[PDB]
Design an enzyme around this catalytic site. Structure first.
Site, PDB file in Angstrom:
ATOM      1  N   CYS A  38       0.843  -1.192   0.000  1.00 41.32           N
ATOM      2  CA  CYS A  38       0.000   0.000   0.000  1.00 41.32           C
ATOM      3  C   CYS A  38       0.882   1.247   0.000  1.00 41.32           C
ATOM      4  O   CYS A  38       2.117   1.163   0.018  1.00 41.32           O
ATOM      5  CB  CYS A  38      -0.915   0.029   1.228  1.00 41.32           C
ATOM      6  SG  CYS A  38      -0.112   0.638   2.738  1.00 41.32           S
ATOM      7  N   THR A  40       1.858   3.118   2.189  1.00 41.37           N
ATOM      8  CA  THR A  40       2.877   3.192   3.235  1.00 41.37           C
ATOM      9  C   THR A  40       4.184   2.570   2.755  1.00 41.37           C
ATOM     10  O   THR A  40       5.261   3.159   2.902  1.00 41.37           O
ATOM     11  CB  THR A  40       2.419   2.483   4.528  1.00 41.37           C
ATOM     12  OG1 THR A  40       1.261   3.153   5.051  1.00 41.37           O
ATOM     13  CG2 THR A  40       3.528   2.510   5.574  1.00 41.37           C
ATOM     14  N   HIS A  43       5.884   4.872   0.482  1.00 41.44           N
ATOM     15  CA  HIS A  43       6.637   5.938   1.134  1.00 41.44           C
ATOM     16  C   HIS A  43       8.029   5.452   1.474  1.00 41.44           C
ATOM     17  O   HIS A  43       9.002   6.176   1.282  1.00 41.44           O
ATOM     18  CB  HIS A  43       5.969   6.393   2.427  1.00 41.44           C
ATOM     19  CG  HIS A  43       4.758   7.241   2.218  1.00 41.44           C
ATOM     20  ND1 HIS A  43       4.698   8.225   1.254  1.00 41.44           N
ATOM     21  CD2 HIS A  43       3.570   7.277   2.872  1.00 41.44           C
ATOM     22  CE1 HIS A  43       3.525   8.833   1.323  1.00 41.44           C
ATOM     23  NE2 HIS A  43       2.822   8.277   2.297  1.00 41.44           N
ATOM     24  N   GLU A  64       0.878  -5.975   5.264  1.00 40.95           N
ATOM     25  CA  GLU A  64      -0.338  -6.580   4.748  1.00 40.95           C
ATOM     26  C   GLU A  64       0.049  -7.980   4.326  1.00 40.95           C
ATOM     27  O   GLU A  64       0.500  -8.179   3.201  1.00 40.95           O
ATOM     28  CB  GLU A  64      -0.850  -5.840   3.519  1.00 40.95           C
ATOM     29  CG  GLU A  64      -1.359  -4.443   3.746  1.00 40.95           C
ATOM     30  CD  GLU A  64      -1.833  -3.811   2.451  1.00 40.95           C
ATOM     31  OE1 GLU A  64      -2.268  -4.549   1.537  1.00 40.95           O
ATOM     32  OE2 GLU A  64      -1.791  -2.582   2.333  1.00 40.95           O
ATOM     33  N   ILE A 176      -8.512   1.476  -0.903  1.00 34.40           N
ATOM     34  CA  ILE A 176      -9.338   1.521   0.293  1.00 34.40           C
ATOM     35  C   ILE A 176     -10.737   2.066   0.042  1.00 34.40           C
ATOM     36  O   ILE A 176     -11.729   1.431   0.409  1.00 34.40           O
ATOM     37  CB  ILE A 176      -8.637   2.328   1.396  1.00 34.40           C
ATOM     38  CG1 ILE A 176      -7.296   1.660   1.713  1.00 34.40           C
ATOM     39  CG2 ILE A 176      -9.507   2.393   2.642  1.00 34.40           C
ATOM     40  CD1 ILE A 176      -6.511   2.329   2.810  1.00 34.40           C
ATOM     41  N   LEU A 261     -10.607   8.963   6.665  1.00 31.18           N
ATOM     42  CA  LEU A 261      -9.476   8.048   6.751  1.00 31.18           C
ATOM     43  C   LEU A 261      -8.301   8.679   5.988  1.00 31.18           C
ATOM     44  O   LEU A 261      -7.147   8.583   6.402  1.00 31.18           O
ATOM     45  CB  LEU A 261      -9.820   6.711   6.104  1.00 31.18           C
ATOM     46  CG  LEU A 261      -8.684   5.695   6.168  1.00 31.18           C
ATOM     47  CD1 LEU A 261      -8.595   5.153   7.580  1.00 31.18           C
ATOM     48  CD2 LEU A 261      -8.924   4.564   5.181  1.00 31.18           C
ATOM     49  N   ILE A 263      -5.374  10.710   4.438  1.00 28.78           N
ATOM     50  CA  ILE A 263      -4.333  11.520   5.056  1.00 28.78           C
ATOM     51  C   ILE A 263      -3.791  12.611   4.121  1.00 28.78           C
ATOM     52  O   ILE A 263      -2.934  12.339   3.284  1.00 28.78           O
ATOM     53  CB  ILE A 263      -3.139  10.643   5.484  1.00 28.78           C
ATOM     54  CG1 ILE A 263      -3.603   9.525   6.418  1.00 28.78           C
ATOM     55  CG2 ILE A 263      -2.090  11.505   6.154  1.00 28.78           C
ATOM     56  CD1 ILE A 263      -4.101  10.002   7.761  1.00 28.78           C
TER      57      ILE A 263
HETATM   58  N1  LIG Z   1      -5.915   6.883   8.745  1.00 27.15           N
HETATM   59  C1  LIG Z   1      -5.211   5.744   8.595  1.00 27.15           C
HETATM   60  O1  LIG Z   1      -4.865   5.006   9.524  1.00 27.15           O
HETATM   61  C2  LIG Z   1      -4.805   5.319   7.164  1.00 27.15           C
HETATM   62  C3  LIG Z   1      -4.324   3.998   6.892  1.00 27.15           C
HETATM   63  C4  LIG Z   1      -3.952   3.608   5.566  1.00 27.15           C
HETATM   64  C5  LIG Z   1      -4.061   4.546   4.493  1.00 27.15           C
HETATM   65  N2  LIG Z   1      -4.546   5.864   4.787  1.00 27.15           N
HETATM   66  C6  LIG Z   1      -4.716   6.954   3.770  1.00 27.15           C
HETATM   67  O2  LIG Z   1      -6.049   6.870   3.254  1.00 27.15           O
HETATM   68  C7  LIG Z   1      -6.107   7.347   1.910  1.00 27.15           C
HETATM   69  C8  LIG Z   1      -6.736   6.290   1.011  1.00 27.15           C
HETATM   70  O3  LIG Z   1      -5.860   5.163   0.806  1.00 27.15           O
HETATM   71  P1  LIG Z   1      -5.684   4.592  -0.693  1.00 27.15           P
HETATM   72  O4  LIG Z   1      -4.748   3.459  -0.644  1.00 27.15           O
HETATM   73  O5  LIG Z   1      -7.015   4.383  -1.357  1.00 27.15           O
HETATM   74  O6  LIG Z   1      -4.967   5.834  -1.409  1.00 27.15           O
HETATM   75  P2  LIG Z   1      -4.705   6.310  -2.928  1.00 27.15           P
HETATM   76  O7  LIG Z   1      -3.810   7.495  -2.903  1.00 27.15           O
HETATM   77  O8  LIG Z   1      -4.331   5.107  -3.712  1.00 27.15           O
HETATM   78  O9  LIG Z   1      -6.156   6.839  -3.392  1.00 27.15           O
HETATM   79  C9  LIG Z   1      -6.548   8.169  -3.159  1.00 27.15           C
HETATM   80  C10 LIG Z   1      -7.500   8.414  -4.306  1.00 27.15           C
HETATM   81  O10 LIG Z   1      -7.974   9.749  -4.170  1.00 27.15           O
HETATM   82  C11 LIG Z   1      -8.407  10.125  -5.467  1.00 27.15           C
HETATM   83  N3  LIG Z   1      -8.659  11.600  -5.555  1.00 27.15           N
HETATM   84  C12 LIG Z   1      -7.776  12.613  -5.664  1.00 27.15           C
HETATM   85  N4  LIG Z   1      -8.403  13.812  -5.740  1.00 27.15           N
HETATM   86  C13 LIG Z   1      -9.674  13.487  -5.674  1.00 27.15           C
HETATM   87  C14 LIG Z   1     -10.726  14.416  -5.726  1.00 27.15           C
HETATM   88  N5  LIG Z   1     -10.498  15.718  -5.850  1.00 27.15           N
HETATM   89  N6  LIG Z   1     -11.973  13.882  -5.638  1.00 27.15           N
HETATM   90  C15 LIG Z   1     -12.189  12.562  -5.516  1.00 27.15           C
HETATM   91  N7  LIG Z   1     -11.173  11.668  -5.473  1.00 27.15           N
HETATM   92  C16 LIG Z   1      -9.897  12.125  -5.553  1.00 27.15           C
HETATM   93  C17 LIG Z   1      -7.292   9.615  -6.355  1.00 27.15           C
HETATM   94  O11 LIG Z   1      -7.726   9.397  -7.698  1.00 27.15           O
HETATM   95  C18 LIG Z   1      -6.842   8.342  -5.682  1.00 27.15           C
HETATM   96  O12 LIG Z   1      -7.231   7.143  -6.380  1.00 27.15           O
HETATM   97  C19 LIG Z   1      -4.681   7.729   1.560  1.00 27.15           C
HETATM   98  O13 LIG Z   1      -4.507   9.138   1.730  1.00 27.15           O
HETATM   99  C20 LIG Z   1      -3.836   6.950   2.548  1.00 27.15           C
HETATM  100  O14 LIG Z   1      -2.562   7.584   2.779  1.00 27.15           O
HETATM  101  C21 LIG Z   1      -4.907   6.228   6.107  1.00 27.15           C
HETATM  102 ZN   LIG Z   2      -1.186  -1.221   4.004  1.00 30.42          ZN
END
Ligand SMILES: NC(=O)c1ccc[n+]([C@@H]2O[C@H](COP(=O)([O-])OP(=O)(O)OC[C@H]3O[C@@H](n4cnc5c(N)ncnc54)[C@H](O)[C@@H]3O)[C@@H](O)[C@H]2O)c1
Ligand SMILES: [Zn+2]
Ligand SMILES: NC(=O)c1ccc[n+]([C@@H]2O[C@H](COP(=O)([O-])OP(=O)(O)OC[C@H]3O[C@@H](n4cnc5c(N)ncnc54)[C@H](O)[C@@H]3O)[C@@H](O)[C@H]2O)c1
Ligand SMILES: NC(=O)c1ccc[n+]([C@@H]2O[C@H](COP(=O)([O-])OP(=O)(O)OC[C@H]3O[C@@H](n4cnc5c(N)ncnc54)[C@H](O)[C@@H]3O)[C@@H](O)[C@H]2O)c1
Ligand SMILES: NC(=O)c1ccc[n+]([C@@H]2O[C@H](COP(=O)([O-])OP(=O)(O)OC[C@H]3O[C@@H](n4cnc5c(N)ncnc54)[C@H](O)[C@@H]3O)[C@@H](O)[C@H]2O)c1
Ligand SMILES: [Zn+2]
Ligand SMILES: [Zn+2]
Ligand SMILES: [Zn+2]
Ligand SMILES: [Zn+2]
Ligand SMILES: [Zn+2]
Ligand SMILES: [Zn+2]
Ligand SMILES: [Zn+2]
Lengths: 343, 343, 343, 343
Positions: A38, A40, A43, A64, A176, A261, A263
């Site tokens: 994922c 992470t 990064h 994972e 997600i 969720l 970030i």
């Molecule tokens: N809070 C936590 O514990 C936790 C844990 C894991 C991941 N995350 C975070 O959650 C988020 C989702 O994870 P992911 O793997 O799906 O990330 P990802 O970056 O793969 O997906 C984010 C999606 O946002 C979309 N996007 C961008 N601008 C947009 C807009 N203006 N309108 C609608 N959609 C838009 C993108 O097309 C992209 O597919 C990430 O930011 C990730 O870092 C948080």
């Molecule tokens: Zn993960």
């Protein structure tokens, strides 16, 4: 034992070869069958700010993953040798405010497998016995490997008032947000709107959303208003994109809930009064998985078949071909990528 | 206009010709397009203890119906002439402790259409404007006619902690139980077990339940033990059968929830300490439909197709043939019987 | 070491003399400073049905106790030598449905200190390290000794919707119901009614209740109706008396909550429909203490001084004079009795 | 009759002589006995950005008041002539998504007495019958006059998980914050900390808070660390000061709740990921008073004496001396100023 590790303060990962670790008091040895990646892991791969101020090489990454319990530490009665188990990446201290309160998902001394200690990108890994979630033998390890991130979606969806019989707007169709759309659809949400400018992933939600929307090609606010009559009751934020956040909040009817969720990469400009207070909105900051409640809900959906995570597994590559796996990550051309540590 | 009424303290009903009611301030005139029958109507029909103590002839019965707003009283802003509507049977007072709290479903002064005043087993019926829930013009009247009992299922299922990602046992495959089965299936419960000795009825649950059980043929408790490994997290009681209740409460795991809609005919023997207190169980007494919250959730599921009630409509008959209609419901060899007041 | 134990399948207890136990892995040795007694210890004392079908002599009894941590088992990092700790009597399996679900208060394999294994009626006792609740050094051990039963009250009061800004009827002014009245009063409940035919204990609530009521001398229903205008919003049941239960439910306004801790001696006659379902009542079966949430709320009230448990400690006798202590129990002439194991 | 109104788009207000308003269908005539002033009234008075975009002269201001029902419109069943009442400032439409949900406090079409239409800074005011909350004839009008702002405190405190048995930090010792301090103290929160740089105001909290803090003199965060050992479980934000907000959110322990009523004057810099998401915080946007649920809780606390607002009434003055009155509030050297419209 084959393992993928970050060996120095730099970009990339190195396929190394370590001795099979032995489990001790309260630990178990898992023979990984499948692992996933994922943002992470990305990064770390890119070795950016986050990674730099968090990763302490040498480290076998991967949080994972799923596999079989090979052996257990002395005195470990659960799980058992032979059990198929998925893994909870957070190792909680059990000695901080959050833990007494039962909010283990935010333990102040959380230790993430594959981020703070050896992870599952190896044929074998040792983890705390309490972190193993036993799965029925017939659940495919590939699906089992993504239960951890699926739990992030579950937690977000079922937080607050849930989504049953409610109108939902999910901003972000990444892996997600995608699982979220699968969950909300199976939870009886409706109408269900999914917004994401990337058509590749946005199309992945077609069989789950009632309305797909490209905020770039269409005006989200107007679509929501045409689908619901006004706004949505629930906002599930998975993009971390400031523009989407402000948009999502506006799409919310007064008194609705925003479950976040996603970030964001930088602080956002936020009009507390206008976007939250005066409209009676409740913003739920979702982190990790509610320790055990999330896993129950999630695996229940999965074991009973209410949801089928199979379609989110787009690629399965041998661990040794990690280079390509991470390229797909950065690409965005895949949803979830499975890594086979046995090759 | 044609109407079906109880004209004297005894068995049966009489097709009579009443003039068309007139809507005054705060009221509307509804042209009934479809109406359904329920256990209550059977009570009134048989003139049993329940009816004898509640019904006051002359009464036009029928509280499960839908139609078009043919007229509105002076000052009635909503709904509007032409609107397709489903009706909330409970008429609340807005001046009691329950109402001040928002618990309109238990208004101390509750009045019920077709029970305390003239209902929908007629071509026309006058009801309070605020009791009309406007439906999309394309929703089939037959389905609109059964949104009221559907709400009883909705209320029960979404009460407490809901059913998403939870193991659920449903005792009672009567009309309302089947509707609950549809709802829980569409809400992501699993495993889902439904118990009812009437094979004709238990069958309609086959496509929604994960395990069907004829408590007379199998030991429900042991079947739940196999299906869940212990007990269910939620018990939705729709039978009113004492044995089912104790059984159902036993199938509950400690800390579980029992949502009860079922109305037992006689007091039960209840080991408060053993079936509720010591096991940390929470019993939810479900009455009516939470005003508007239940209708929102329920119509949301229906409008979006999350659930489809059509298979529950087993029979259709002109109001003039009510005798046949009640007999069917009486036999238990029918689920939702639709009466057409125009014929 | 002086200890009070049940040595054979018979009435009474025997003051014996055992070797100081040593703590092992995950255990601690507590040097008791104060202990208390409740109806449970009485059951054992009387050696009745309950006790007979549960107690396995030889057993050092006592589950309400506090003290200092003398030594810890190997590898125990919390609590620490010197800490003043109160004890949670339930030892949970951490391997049953209830525990995954987080309902440890109802663990299916609960093991109660002083009921299933040696308790605190001794100068020293060994218990699981996770069961010790550290208290500030300045909290008197005598108050600390009753935190366990106080937790039963806290759990009942704060279950469901709590009592802040709500009208409350507490049936039963025994030690627990008494602590409840202290809690609800400090939680902002109002009006607050306390009912108990025994004037000795009923007078103990005078400084906490808004209305004291002797159901024998006065008609409870009428008093409630005169104090609230109709019914109460919350019912806290601590008597286990069938008559009180039925009365309490009637005093509840429709849609209110009944929180039941009281353990009736025999199954009650219960009209599900009339007392629960049709009135939209939710009955919460309260058991034990929500593991940790209850202790937080409870000790917070106590540490900050929102409540003062001092007035409930009526007698303090040396452990060696247990005979009198148990006589006071049966008598009912005392509220809480403290036992000093050092004499 | 005497009245205070904004007669043109500029600073100040004008004592004018208006005829006595007439109550029509669904309305009542209230003879104002007392009215109070709040920040909003100051906005209108100063004619700042907020006022300029919301006020439409000519407007009789005043939304915090109480009096006697001198007359009722045709068909008004309640309240009744002679009744002592407090008024809900928000007038809801009963025809929007918020209202259908019961979230009347955020009605899309909210109209506010003394803001959008004539308010209580007059001898008489016509309001919707449903907006009059009947108080006990013995409740002092002065207190009845401030039940509206008191409700804002009540709503904030009891929102989410409430404050019983929880550590609470209150940022903002303004009128509403002080009221919140009284409420939380009476609700059993502890430790209770209140922060505000205005010493005159911080002082009124002394009898309710466990720790008072002048954020300018001490480091609020470090003070909370000493008082709780880490952070607070609940943050009640009543300042609208960005710095206070970030500080307050930092004092929150992971998984805590932030209930926000405060209206910041300008958008804030918000690190969504760091201050909300990653720490599992839940931010509750508090707007107005939950219709009836808030009034019930609040009047319950007041009627029973659980709380006593009297000490908040720092000044009393005839309406003719409003200038002096507004100046006081403007200086911040006053809490609740009462205006008497009869003089
Ligand atoms: N809070 C936590 O514990 C936790 C844990 C894991 C991941 N995350 C975070 O959650 C988020 C989702 O994870 P992911 O793997 O799906 O990330 P990802 O970056 O793969 O997906 C984010 C999606 O946002 C979309 N996007 C961008 N601008 C947009 C807009 N203006 N309108 C609608 N959609 C838009 C993108 O097309 C992209 O597919 C990430 O930011 C990730 O870092 C948080
Ligand atoms: Zn993960
Ligand atoms: N609380 C309320 O406001 C409210 C409103 C409407 C209806 N109800 C009540 O809810 C219940 C459900 O309504 P319905 O129309 O579906 O009822 P119904 O009478 O049609 O169905 C009850 C079902 O229970 C089944 N049953 C009998 N014994 C059983 C057992 N031992 N185990 C499992 N199932 C068993 C019967 O075969 C029957 O199909 C009824 O008792 C009704 O009176 C309550
Ligand atoms: N659920 C649990 O986990 C748990 C744990 C501990 C104790 N308990 C039980 O909770 C109950 C309360 O504990 P306690 O120590 O206060 O018990 P207790 O027996 O000392 O007090 C019960 C009180 O009920 C009063 N009472 C009897 N009839 C009444 C009536 N008709 N109306 C009003 N009051 C009436 C009595 O005067 C008595 O003081 C007991 O039944 C006890 O066995 C339950
Ligand atoms: N959401 C709603 O519906 C609603 C309704 C009424 C009022 N409000 C708002 O709620 C807030 C409270 O109302 P009020 O009348 O008590 O306000 P007020 O302006 O009288 O008090 C705000 C207080 O914040 C204090 N403060 C400033 N900086 C601080 C800091 N850094 N740390 C701690 N405290 C600090 C000030 O000294 C002042 O006493 C206001 O912002 C008001 O606009 C909201
Ligand atoms: Zn921790
Ligand atoms: Zn019916
Ligand atoms: Zn009513
Ligand atoms: Zn005890
Ligand atoms: Zn257990
Ligand atoms: Zn105000
Ligand atoms: Zn509205």
């Amino acid at each position: 034992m084959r393992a993928l590790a970050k060996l120095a303060p730099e970009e990339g990962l190195t396929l190394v070869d370590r001795p099979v670790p032995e489990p001790g008091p309260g630990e178990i040895l898992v023979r990984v069958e499948a692992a996933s990646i994922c943002g992470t892991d990305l990064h770390i791969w890119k070795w950016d700010a986050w990674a730099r101020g968090r990763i302490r090489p040498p480290l076998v990454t991967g949080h994972e993953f799923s596999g079989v319990v090979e052996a257990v530490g002395p005195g470990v009665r659960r799980p058992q040798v032979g059990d198929h188990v998925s893994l909870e990446s957070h190792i909680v201290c059990h000695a901080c405010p959050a833990c007494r309160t039962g909010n283990y998902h935010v333990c102040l001394n959380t230790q993430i497998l594959g981020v703070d200690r050896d992870g599952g990108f190896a044929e074998y890994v040792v983890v705390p016995a309490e972190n193993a979630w036993v799965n029925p033998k017939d659940l495919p390890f590939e699906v089992a490997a993504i239960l951890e991130p699926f739990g992030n979606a579950v937690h977000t969806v079922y937080a607050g008032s849930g989504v049953s019989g409610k109108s939902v707007l999910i901003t972000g169709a990444g892996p997600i947000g995608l699982m979220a759309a699968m969950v909300v659809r199976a939870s009886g949400a409706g109408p269900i709107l999914v917004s994401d400018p990337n058509p590749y992933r946005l199309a992945f939600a077609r069989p789950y959303a009632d309305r797909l929307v490209n905020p770039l090609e269409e005006d989200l606010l107007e679509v929501v208003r045409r689908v619901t009559g006004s706004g949505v009751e629930v906002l599930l934020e998975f993009s971390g994109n400031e523009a989407a956040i402000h948009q999502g909040l506006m799409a919310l009817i007064p008194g609705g809930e925003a479950r976040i969720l996603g970030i964001p990469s930088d602080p956002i400009r936020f009009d507390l009064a206008g976007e939250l207070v005066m409209r009676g909105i409740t913003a739920f900051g979702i982190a990790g998985r509610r320790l055990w409640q999330t896993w129950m809900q999630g695996t229940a959906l999965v074991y009973s078949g209410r949801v089928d995570l199979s379609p989110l597994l787009t690629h399965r590559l041998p661990l040794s071909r990690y280079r390509e796996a991470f390229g797909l990550l950065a690409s965005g051309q895949a949803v979830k990528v499975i890594l086979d540590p046995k090759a």
